[PDB]
């Protein structure tokens, strides 16, 4: 049974809420995919998760407790304020915004208007639809924000509509990277 | 758990046999960098980032070194409970709207990976490609499995087939995930 | 220079 593989995982997490004014530190010791031990800056100590971590529990606490508790400050708080502020929490990527009509046009005929908002960062954004400068609220839907994996996100928002003479629909995008909203029109 | 931001500063993954290891830094789900254990070098996904912050690979090495250690004290303590293969799930989507002739990137997302060992490749017209293709490290999941993305730059064509070949032990046959413009 | 969480050893 050589095809009998193995693996352990060490997964640290620094949860930041409102700057560093509030941090929760979590350390997960994993075997294959079972979590057997863990540290929680909220529980205040190491605790055995499964039966497997029953051994380590006492040894990890007696030894590394004070050292692990401190990481909330030496790793978490420190990194956030020293490395994150000038990189992550400063990256602002304006999105591209296009509008494509779902089916072929046809006056007075049920159709959709898709607004593609791609390549932006961070994720928090807001896309609106307007019809003759009057906001369309009914028949507006969207996809699940997509994490492209290359430090950018994308999303598509639909507007079921009915193309009529002289109508000008508008996609409205507001983002932390925009001094003012990006507005794209679609003319009937 | 909830918060405005999350940072995994030092995710270690030691896999035996093969002494296969990964060491990464993750922030809000994206990948900052990984320590190339062979070159003893810190590989940043974003260039402009390494010009404002840095990390010493030795830290990677030291912790990987501990992964090796612990993955043994455990592999034994668990009476050797081998790990359980899973079946990965691929999903192919564009990066931006596919305009004909207009450059673009094909993104293949693969979730539910376990263990983190896998071959992802592209195929243009059932024929394979190996170029202009790049992939991310193994991102962790809440259920302790992983996911990874592979990228294939290309030019939108009204006569081009594409596939995301995904090979993994927990997959009898290499799964393919079609896509067309 | 950023730091990292120490993957403690066992036994």
């Amino acid at each position: 049974d050589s095809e009998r593989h193995f693996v352990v995982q060490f997964q640290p997490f620094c949860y930041f809420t409102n700057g560093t004014q509030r941090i929760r530190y979590v350390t997960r010791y994993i075997y294959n995919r079972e979590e057997y031990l863990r540290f929680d800056s909220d529980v205040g100590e190491y605790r055995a998760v499964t039966e497997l971590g029953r051994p380590d529990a006492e040894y990890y606490n007696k030894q590394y407790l004070e050292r692990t508790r401190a990481e909330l400050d030496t790793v978490c708080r420190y990194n956030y304020e020293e490395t994150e502020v000038p990189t992550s929490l400063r990256r602002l990527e304006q999105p591209n915004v296009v509008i494509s009509l779902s089916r072929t046009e046809a006056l007075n005929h049920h159709n959709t208007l898709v607004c593609s908002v791609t390549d932006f960062y961070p994720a928090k954004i807001k896309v609106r639809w307007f019809r003759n400068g009057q906001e369309e609220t009914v028949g507006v839907s969207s996809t699940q924000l997509i994490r492209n994996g290359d430090w950018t996100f994308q999303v598509l928002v639909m507007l079921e509509m009915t193309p009529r003479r002289g109508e000008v629909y508008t996609c409205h995008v507001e983002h932390p990277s925009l001094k003012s909203p990006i507005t794209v029109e679609w003319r009937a | 758990i909830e918060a405005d931001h999350v940072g995994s500063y030092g995710i270690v993954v030691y896999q035996s046999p093969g002494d296969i290891g990964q060491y990464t830094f993750e922030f809000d789900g994206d990948e900052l960098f990984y320590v190339d254990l062979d070159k003893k070098e810190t590989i940043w996904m974003l260039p402009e980032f390494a010009q404002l912050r840095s990390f010493d690979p030795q830290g990677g090495l030291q912790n990987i070194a501990t992964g090796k250690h612990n993955l043994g004290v455990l592999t034994k303590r668990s009476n050797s409970t081998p790990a359980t293969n899973e079946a990965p799930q691929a999903t192919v989507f564009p990066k931006s709207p596919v305009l004909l002739g207009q450059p673009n990137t094909l993104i293949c997302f693969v979730d539910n990976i376990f263990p983190p060992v896998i071959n992802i490749t592209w195929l243009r017209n059932s024929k394979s490609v190996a170029d202009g293709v790049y992939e991310t490290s193994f991102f962790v999941n809440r259920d302790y499995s992983f996911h990874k993305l592979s990228y294939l730059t290309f030019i939108p064509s009204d006569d081009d087939i594409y596939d995301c070949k995904v090979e993994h032990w927990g997959l009898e046959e290499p799964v393919l995930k079609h896509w067309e413009p | 220079r950023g730091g990292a969480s120490q993957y403690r050893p066992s036994q």
Partner: T-cell receptor
Amino acid sequence: DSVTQTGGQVALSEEDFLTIHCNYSASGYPALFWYVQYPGEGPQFLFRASRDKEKGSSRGFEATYNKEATSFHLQKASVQESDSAVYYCALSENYGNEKITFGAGTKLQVVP
Amino acid sequence: AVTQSPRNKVAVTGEKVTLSCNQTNNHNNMYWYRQDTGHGLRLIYYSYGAGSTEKGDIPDGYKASRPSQENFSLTLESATPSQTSVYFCASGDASGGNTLYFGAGTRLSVL
């Protein structure tokens, strides 16, 4: 990184008050310690301190992590003739390196 | 504990010298320091485990090997007078700022 510490040699009488200065110059958030090198032996751990304001102690010796003045000054009640040894101040970064940097050391001579 | 060998080495310029260190602490970390006046301890080499050779702060003129767990050796290819000093070996469990355990040293002089 560097750990700069009090001169080279100091001399005290028994019962005197010990104070050995140590300032450090680090890039991250380092752990600080003190080791002792008794005559004819190798250095040895005394106590550590992982974060600002934390105090470390051992065998009557103590030092408080002061991030503000980047100091980790060693202090003791009243020294004893057997305290004569070389005191090393040191640090380790928060990078996981496991690299322990040291200072020049300070020779302490407690007169009988 | 930790033990070194030899505990006194008189050597000649050019000669190839080697120091040996053993430990029953079972730590995965082992280091090679040298003590000089005005310099204190300075790290030359250390290892994260068997097969590990990490260059410390003052590597030049040195080489090392961690053939197993309990043994880490340092080698001066072409010994020189500037390499005259007391060498101390140490082991650590690799637990963030791992406290270090030192051997009694090896007094070496290059005439």
